[PDB]
Amino acid sequence: MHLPNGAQIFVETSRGEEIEATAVTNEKNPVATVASKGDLAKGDYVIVTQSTWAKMVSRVLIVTDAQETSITLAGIDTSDTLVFPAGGTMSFAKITGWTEIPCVQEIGQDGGEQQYYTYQCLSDDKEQQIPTFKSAISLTYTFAHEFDNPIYQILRKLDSSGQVTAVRMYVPKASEMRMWAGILSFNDIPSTQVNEMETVELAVSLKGDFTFISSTLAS
Amino acid sequence: MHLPNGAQIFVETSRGEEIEATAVTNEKNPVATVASKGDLAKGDYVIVTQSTWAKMVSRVLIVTDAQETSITLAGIDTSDTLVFPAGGTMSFAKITGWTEIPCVQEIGQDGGEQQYYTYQCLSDDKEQQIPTFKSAISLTYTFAHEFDNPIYQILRKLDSSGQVTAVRMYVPKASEMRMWAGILSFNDIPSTQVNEMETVELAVSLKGDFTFISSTLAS
Amino acid sequence: MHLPNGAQIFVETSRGEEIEATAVTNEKNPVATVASKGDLAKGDYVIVTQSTWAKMVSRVLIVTDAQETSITLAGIDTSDTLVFPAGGTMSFAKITGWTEIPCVQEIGQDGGEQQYYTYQCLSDDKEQQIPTFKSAISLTYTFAHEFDNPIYQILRKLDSSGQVTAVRMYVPKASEMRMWAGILSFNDIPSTQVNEMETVELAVSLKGDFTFISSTLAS
Amino acid sequence: MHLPNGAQIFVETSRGEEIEATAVTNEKNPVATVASKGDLAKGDYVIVTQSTWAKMVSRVLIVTDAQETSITLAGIDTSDTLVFPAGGTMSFAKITGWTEIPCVQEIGQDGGEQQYYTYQCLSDDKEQQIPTFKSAISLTYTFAHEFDNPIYQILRKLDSSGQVTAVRMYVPKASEMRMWAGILSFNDIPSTQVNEMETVELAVSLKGDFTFISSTLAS
Amino acid sequence: MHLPNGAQIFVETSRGEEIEATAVTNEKNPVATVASKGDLAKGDYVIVTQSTWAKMVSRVLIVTDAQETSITLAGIDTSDTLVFPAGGTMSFAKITGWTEIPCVQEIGQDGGEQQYYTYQCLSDDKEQQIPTFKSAISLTYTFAHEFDNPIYQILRKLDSSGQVTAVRMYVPKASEMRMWAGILSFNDIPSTQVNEMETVELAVSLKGDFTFISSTLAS
Amino acid sequence: MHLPNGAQIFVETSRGEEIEATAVTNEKNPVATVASKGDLAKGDYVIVTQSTWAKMVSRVLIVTDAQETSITLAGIDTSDTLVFPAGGTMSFAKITGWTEIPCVQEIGQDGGEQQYYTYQCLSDDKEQQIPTFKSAISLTYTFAHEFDNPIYQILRKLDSSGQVTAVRMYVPKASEMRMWAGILSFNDIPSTQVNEMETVELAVSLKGDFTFISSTLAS
Amino acid sequence: MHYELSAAARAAFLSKYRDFPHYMENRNFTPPKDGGMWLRFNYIEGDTLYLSIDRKCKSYIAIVQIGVVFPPGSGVDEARLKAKEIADFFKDGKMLNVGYIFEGAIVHQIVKHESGWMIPVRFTVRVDTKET
Amino acid sequence: MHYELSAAARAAFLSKYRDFPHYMENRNFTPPKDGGMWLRFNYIEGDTLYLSIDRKCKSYIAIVQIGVVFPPGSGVDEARLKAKEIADFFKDGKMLNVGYIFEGAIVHQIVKHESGWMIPVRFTVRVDTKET
Amino acid sequence: MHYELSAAARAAFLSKYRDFPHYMENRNFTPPKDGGMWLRFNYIEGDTLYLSIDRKCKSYIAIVQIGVVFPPGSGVDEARLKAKEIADFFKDGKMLNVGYIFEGAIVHQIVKHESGWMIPVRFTVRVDTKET
Amino acid sequence: MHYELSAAARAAFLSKYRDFPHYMENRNFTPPKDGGMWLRFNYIEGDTLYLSIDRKCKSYIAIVQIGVVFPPGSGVDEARLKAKEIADFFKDGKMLNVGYIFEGAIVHQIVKHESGWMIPVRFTVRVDTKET
Amino acid sequence: MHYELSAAARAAFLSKYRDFPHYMENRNFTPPKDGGMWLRFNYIEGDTLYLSIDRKCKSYIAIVQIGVVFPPGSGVDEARLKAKEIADFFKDGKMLNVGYIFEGAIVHQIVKHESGWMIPVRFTVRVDTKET
């Protein structure tokens, strides 16, 4: 029960060395075994690049506990076992830094309308429909245009590469954190009109699922 | 002739063991024979899971009188015998608990526009049509988004399972109470916009028919 | 040149035993021969279920004069002979009662726009078009939702049976009386909104043609 | 350069015996030879039913001079000879009476948009089009509904017959007369609403071309 | 940088005897050799009916200097040589008179939107397009209807003939003066409504190109 | 974060002799070797007509340093080497002069919305989309119509030839400066209405991509 | 036809309330000596609508207002009861001898003055006419 | 062209009611000593419309208002009747010497003053012109 | 059905606040000698809506305003306490014995004076009826 | 609940500007003898919104007005600087102990008087509540 | 950032017209003895716009009004010439040392008073700020 004003946007800029996990258990808060400590620490995000489990791939997780061999990740529930067969191995990297877009004018989205399959049986008369797949979700952002902004080069090279990038969005009023990753696209044609600011647009597709983490737990 | 302000919403959360009924007679207020009384008492709702009577299946009924062998169900009329041939077997369960969604902003729906079959005969010149089946019905709800609320997991697991679930709507001004059951769909994409509340979406399909009973009689 | 304010609407509820007429002549006010008087009296409405003459089938008429053998029907003109060849026998019942809908919010209609057929000839240049059949007529009725209304059972049973029903409309201001028959369609899903009435839907198809008569003559 | 306020509409109701004309010449006011004077007099309209000349079929003309053998028609120009070859025979009737519609609310029309044929040649680049046939013309009229109006049967039988009927319209301000012939179509379902008049729709197609004459010359 | 109010429109009504030309040179202001002077003098418009050069067909030009053998034309530039090959011949007439339409309500036009061709190549990723031909041009005019207007007959017979005609426009504010030619179309069904003037519709297509000259030079 | 008011538009009118560059390296500011400087100097624009590198073709660049043999270009980044294989040769001309369109009213654009490829696999249920190519871009310009403006014939010949032309945009507030090239389209149909100015249309397609350089660097 | 509208409205109201103290237009009337309630009569002219295109079938709309006055310090419930009775008498669809009530029985908010209070009741009558 | 229209309308009204006491534009007139009804004459100027794009064909609109006054305490029926005959006489579509009645026979609401009451009757007239 | 609604509103408010000083319609009331807070009672007549086309089912809306007055120089939080308690007692959905509260517990801005301040609480009541 | 909003606003304002002379609601206050600038606290009440269909989640919106006054002829820049200090303190999104600032720090045009000038600054507080 | 915009506008204006007699806000000033023309300086606060969702980038709009006053009975052409010169100097796109002229050089209607006439000239200045 809150107003979404005051939110902020951040985007992934550089990722560390790939880290391989050999086995992870299933529970409310998953914990996995890692070959080495590496450079992991308290409260730094990770992106999973590929794994045996189909649902968990392309997801942003937050580290909970760190030890020499045990790493604890929260943000995903693994209580169910049939959907999460045992003996799965993880593979993820870490996000070294973050960058923040200048002040953003509006936020828009599209899709999400659930589809239905309509079937009529000759035995009955009333027609009944069943739910089906969901439409794709695309997040588009618009913000002030700047000639010398240093993030423009980052966005251009990210668009050229097409590599999957993590996006962070923080809400102060409700104190949640939204984690998701997708393909980024950028537009560099100014919206030129008369007697108002001119903008450029940025769109983010979706590759995984939204995960929400408490701000205090995150930091 | 009443205003629908002040209505309330409840959703099924847990059901008891399946109870098999051997035979039910046909009249204004049906009564059925049960092997064991079990945990049934006065004023508990039941969902019908499968029965020979095609129109009767996938419905929520309310108990009227309970005995060791006889259970009276009200809300459905079985006066007609051609649509309800005698010697039909009955099988149902009992709903244990309920949960109410936080305050609902708008309620939406679609369908019900009866289609027609239009035929033109060469003998005559005026064109006449015939009524035909009715379109599918879907119910859409809107309510405030909240992360810490518990029913989010219940809604996610109901969507994952796809199992039929009962819904209760209570209207105080008209003293009415509507029963129906269907498939659930939960949307977890907050609608972020400047200077108004952000909400989420819940959709309910339909598998049976609406039943209208007296709230005072039910409880 | 009259207002439709204060109009009232009635629907057929019960019909008497079928009455067969063996001989009827053609004139401004036709008179038919009946085997027995029956319960026919002054100013009681009749519905024709089937007859040799094609046009007047499925029509509502009003009696004018009653005798032990001769019955007078007014509302349709039978002066023409080519459309109404002699040796026609009638078959009609008597509407025993009527019921009226609670207060009706709005009345809408659709169809009736006459179609036209276009022929272009190579001999000339300007194109000319020819009238064709007219689209079907459907009438939709709206009235406030209720739970205890006893007419609901009649409406549902008529919808299930699919029998042709007579519909009557009375306009007090200009003192006419409209008559027609068709098939009924009923919806019992209330239109829930915030801070106004909630209503249900009733629709009537059309099988015959409108007949206009004076209420003073009717009663 | 005038206002069409106060205009009036009249429609043919009955035609006299067929009148045959043996020879007519071509000039600005055609003069024709008729076997007998008949009942023709000064200032009575005629409608042509069929003739050798293709252009002037289904046209309304006004008499200028009447003699025992020579009749004079005004309203159509016959100066040219290639389009109106000599040796043509006329066949027309005389309209006996006229009827006027009750007070008419709104007048509408549709059609007349000139179609074009677009051709592109590889020799050039700019595309040019050529004029072609026009769309058919329809005139729509609306007026207050009345049950006791004696012209309702006349309109019904005219619609049933489909016979081509002459229409006249009088404009007092411009002192002109527009006359034409076409097919009539009538609608008898009132447009019921709240707190305004309910009307019916009368539409007329076209079979010939418009004719304009002076009111002083006519009478 | 001017306002188009106060403009006037004239239309070709009659042309003189056809005049042949033997040879013309190419320059800024063309000069052509003619067999005879004819009736040509200063400041009279000419229309070319057919010529070797494809670009200049159906063009309206103005005479600049007249001699017994040499006629100078202004309005078309012939500096280019590859598009205007040498040894070109002319064939034009002289426009005798002009007529003006009564006071005109609205001036409208459509078409001219240049089309594009989009081709996508597998070697590249961005899509680029190439311009193509332009759509046709049609000009429409609306002016007050009048019974006794004599120019109606001229428009009627010009529409019947379908001959190519010139139209002229004079704008006083900018001292410019437009000339072009095309095919005509007239509509004689007024648009009657309540409490305003009534009009008819005139349309002209485009067969050539616009010519722009100084009005002072013209006269 | 700036206002585009006061911006200016220029279009290329004439180019010089073609100049060939034998080899150019890849870095932040590329440097190329040429046989002779030609007439190049500090801070003048160049257009590249054809080159080995696929994307740099049809681009507007600015020189940074000039020598007898070495030329330095800015506006395109050549930090990457896989997109710029070494040993490439350039071929570019020098724009001699520029023209300024009279004062322009509006500026509009269309396209740029990227397409998506939606794929659904039987293995999963949620649908995901991937980016695809971007739509073509067309710039539309509107400015006051002038009959004696000497830019008109230059625009006409450019449109007729179809030669690719450079377009220059200068924005004072942001100290930015835009460069691009495309095909020009001119519309010479004055949009005449009542009591406001009348304009013509100029449109520019796109074949390269936008380049931004600082105004102080430009001059 | 506008004279007959006022005539019929006066006829109906006067037949209903002959004996009650009442005031009509432009007649010198004095309030009752004891200060009891009295009725006020007014007539308001509405616009006339042109329906057809030939300007022959016309309509006339009129607004009729009845005011109930009462002394200060004597309560309001009897006045509200009287207004309710007036509204009950003036039902919608009632047929006057020359026209009919278009919509009626409306009670507006009380106007208050330091010398006495007044409650207005307003309704409308309509006549559709034909010319030849 | 606005002078001749006013002259013609004034001439028509004056020829109809020459004998009855009346008041014209900007001439000193004293009301009748007895206090009987007398008529008031007024003229209102309307806008002029440019119809075409060449600004040659135009139109002129005028509004005419007439008033009936009556002393207080004499009722309203005589005045309403008089207004009724005035409205009947000034019917729609009548042709004047230079122009014609665009829309006529309107009666508006009564303006009340403690010294005497007034009822207005208003209509409109029109002329169409083309200047070459 | 307008008299009953006012009677019911008066009954409810008065039964809740028998003892505390208050002022009602058209009754000569004097403020308390001490000058402490007292309540004001007002009734505002809203429009009446015709629901159907046959002119038989109707609704009545009314506005009830209660004003809390208090002396100058004594603060405002006591008045705000009284206001919140009034609003809490008059919640939405409460069913009066003739009608029901359409929408309740609205507090508007304080009107300020040099002799004594007043803060209003306004809500609305509704009754729906079917004439048979 | 509406009292808590005013209480929280008073707490924050009074804690920030204890020492500075200021005027509270409905308290007899005398200006400083030297005529130096003093603060004027004021409270404006807005509407209350019913969000849902069960009439259970509500919103309260209030307007808070702070006015600065300064003697004539002493300049205006220092008053502007003080108002900027106030606005910067009352920044957007601040979490009040009961509600929160919907939007703050808006300065409006100066009002001019011949005895002393005044600059108003205005913001709004909001509370969303769920009723159980 | 509103102090600096006013300071910049004042600095530019007085740098251009230091010598010519003028009046500026909230300072007691006497008109010239000989009755010649003099300048007036005014400052009007616009609105403050919140651009982004996070409320970090804002904009401030201000309106500057300069009036030229001249004695009655002395004509208008010299005043018009002076106003034209002022408008020509204060053209669009000029860059101040803090903000910039959004749009300028507008001349409005003459206000007439029997003691002396005035011609206004109005333009607007803008600042776009980003707080980190």
PDB file of N, CA and C in Angstrom, chain C residues 13 16-17 23 28-29 37-38 49 60 73 78 84 86 102 119-120 142 163 165 172 184 195 201 204 207:
ATOM      1  N   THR C  13     -47.393 -15.855 -20.178  1.00  0.00           N
ATOM      2  CA  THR C  13     -47.038 -16.772 -19.104  1.00  0.00           C
ATOM      3  C   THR C  13     -47.728 -18.126 -19.237  1.00  0.00           C
ATOM      4  N   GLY C  16     -53.938 -21.467 -23.218  1.00  0.00           N
ATOM      5  CA  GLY C  16     -55.012 -22.426 -23.087  1.00  0.00           C
ATOM      6  C   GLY C  16     -54.891 -23.559 -24.087  1.00  0.00           C
ATOM      7  N   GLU C  17     -55.953 -24.355 -24.159  1.00  0.00           N
ATOM      8  CA  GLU C  17     -55.991 -25.487 -25.072  1.00  0.00           C
ATOM      9  C   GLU C  17     -56.046 -25.000 -26.514  1.00  0.00           C
ATOM     10  N   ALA C  23     -62.684 -22.529 -41.180  1.00  0.00           N
ATOM     11  CA  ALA C  23     -62.921 -21.669 -42.329  1.00  0.00           C
ATOM     12  C   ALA C  23     -62.886 -20.213 -41.894  1.00  0.00           C
ATOM     13  N   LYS C  28     -61.274  -6.712 -44.570  1.00  0.00           N
ATOM     14  CA  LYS C  28     -60.618  -5.798 -43.639  1.00  0.00           C
ATOM     15  C   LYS C  28     -60.524  -6.400 -42.244  1.00  0.00           C
ATOM     16  N   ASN C  29     -61.634  -6.918 -41.727  1.00  0.00           N
ATOM     17  CA  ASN C  29     -61.663  -7.585 -40.427  1.00  0.00           C
ATOM     18  C   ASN C  29     -62.108  -9.023 -40.634  1.00  0.00           C
ATOM     19  N   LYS C  37     -67.417 -22.645 -29.043  1.00  0.00           N
ATOM     20  CA  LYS C  37     -67.073 -21.353 -28.459  1.00  0.00           C
ATOM     21  C   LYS C  37     -65.851 -21.462 -27.556  1.00  0.00           C
ATOM     22  N   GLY C  38     -65.790 -22.510 -26.737  1.00  0.00           N
ATOM     23  CA  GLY C  38     -64.708 -22.613 -25.781  1.00  0.00           C
ATOM     24  C   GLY C  38     -64.830 -21.555 -24.697  1.00  0.00           C
ATOM     25  N   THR C  49     -50.337 -20.414 -34.055  1.00  0.00           N
ATOM     26  CA  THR C  49     -49.183 -21.305 -34.027  1.00  0.00           C
ATOM     27  C   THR C  49     -48.819 -21.854 -35.399  1.00  0.00           C
ATOM     28  N   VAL C  60     -49.773 -12.300 -33.265  1.00  0.00           N
ATOM     29  CA  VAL C  60     -50.655 -12.017 -32.141  1.00  0.00           C
ATOM     30  C   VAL C  60     -51.812 -11.181 -32.667  1.00  0.00           C
ATOM     31  N   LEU C  73     -61.531 -11.380 -35.948  1.00  0.00           N
ATOM     32  CA  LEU C  73     -60.149 -11.027 -35.664  1.00  0.00           C
ATOM     33  C   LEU C  73     -59.811  -9.704 -36.335  1.00  0.00           C
ATOM     34  N   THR C  78     -56.941  -8.392 -44.528  1.00  0.00           N
ATOM     35  CA  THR C  78     -57.002  -9.481 -45.494  1.00  0.00           C
ATOM     36  C   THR C  78     -57.816  -9.080 -46.716  1.00  0.00           C
ATOM     37  N   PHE C  84     -53.605 -13.755 -50.028  1.00  0.00           N
ATOM     38  CA  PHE C  84     -54.414 -14.524 -49.083  1.00  0.00           C
ATOM     39  C   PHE C  84     -55.431 -15.346 -49.862  1.00  0.00           C
ATOM     40  N   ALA C  86     -58.144 -18.152 -50.844  1.00  0.00           N
ATOM     41  CA  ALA C  86     -59.231 -18.675 -50.033  1.00  0.00           C
ATOM     42  C   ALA C  86     -58.943 -20.111 -49.594  1.00  0.00           C
ATOM     43  N   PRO C 102     -40.164  -5.907 -13.729  1.00  0.00           N
ATOM     44  CA  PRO C 102     -39.958  -4.725 -12.882  1.00  0.00           C
ATOM     45  C   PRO C 102     -39.418  -3.555 -13.694  1.00  0.00           C
ATOM     46  N   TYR C 119     -26.228  -3.566 -59.562  1.00  0.00           N
ATOM     47  CA  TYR C 119     -25.930  -4.079 -60.892  1.00  0.00           C
ATOM     48  C   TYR C 119     -25.386  -2.964 -61.772  1.00  0.00           C
ATOM     49  N   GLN C 120     -24.224  -3.207 -62.372  1.00  0.00           N
ATOM     50  CA  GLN C 120     -23.593  -2.272 -63.294  1.00  0.00           C
ATOM     51  C   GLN C 120     -23.620  -2.874 -64.691  1.00  0.00           C
ATOM     52  N   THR C 142     -33.430  -4.116 -20.353  1.00  0.00           N
ATOM     53  CA  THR C 142     -32.586  -3.971 -19.175  1.00  0.00           C
ATOM     54  C   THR C 142     -33.445  -3.605 -17.976  1.00  0.00           C
ATOM     55  N   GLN C 163     -39.698 -22.345 -26.370  1.00  0.00           N
ATOM     56  CA  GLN C 163     -40.996 -22.134 -26.992  1.00  0.00           C
ATOM     57  C   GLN C 163     -41.179 -20.672 -27.387  1.00  0.00           C
ATOM     58  N   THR C 165     -42.847 -17.210 -27.493  1.00  0.00           N
ATOM     59  CA  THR C 165     -43.575 -16.496 -26.455  1.00  0.00           C
ATOM     60  C   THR C 165     -44.066 -15.161 -26.995  1.00  0.00           C
ATOM     61  N   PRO C 172     -49.099   4.391 -22.907  1.00  0.00           N
ATOM     62  CA  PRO C 172     -50.286   5.134 -22.456  1.00  0.00           C
ATOM     63  C   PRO C 172     -50.495   6.455 -23.168  1.00  0.00           C
ATOM     64  N   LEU C 184     -36.874 -16.103 -26.375  1.00  0.00           N
ATOM     65  CA  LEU C 184     -36.379 -15.348 -25.232  1.00  0.00           C
ATOM     66  C   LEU C 184     -34.956 -15.775 -24.894  1.00  0.00           C
ATOM     67  N   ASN C 195     -21.414   2.580  -7.189  1.00  0.00           N
ATOM     68  CA  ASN C 195     -22.272   3.741  -6.938  1.00  0.00           C
ATOM     69  C   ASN C 195     -23.334   3.938  -8.023  1.00  0.00           C
ATOM     70  N   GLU C 201     -29.895  -8.881 -18.055  1.00  0.00           N
ATOM     71  CA  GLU C 201     -30.180  -8.702 -19.472  1.00  0.00           C
ATOM     72  C   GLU C 201     -31.263  -9.670 -19.929  1.00  0.00           C
ATOM     73  N   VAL C 204     -35.114 -10.463 -26.832  1.00  0.00           N
ATOM     74  CA  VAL C 204     -36.204 -11.115 -27.547  1.00  0.00           C
ATOM     75  C   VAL C 204     -35.886 -11.093 -29.033  1.00  0.00           C
ATOM     76  N   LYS C 207     -40.101 -13.430 -34.776  1.00  0.00           N
ATOM     77  CA  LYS C 207     -40.568 -14.414 -35.744  1.00  0.00           C
ATOM     78  C   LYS C 207     -41.669 -13.904 -36.658  1.00  0.00           C
TER      79      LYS C 207
END
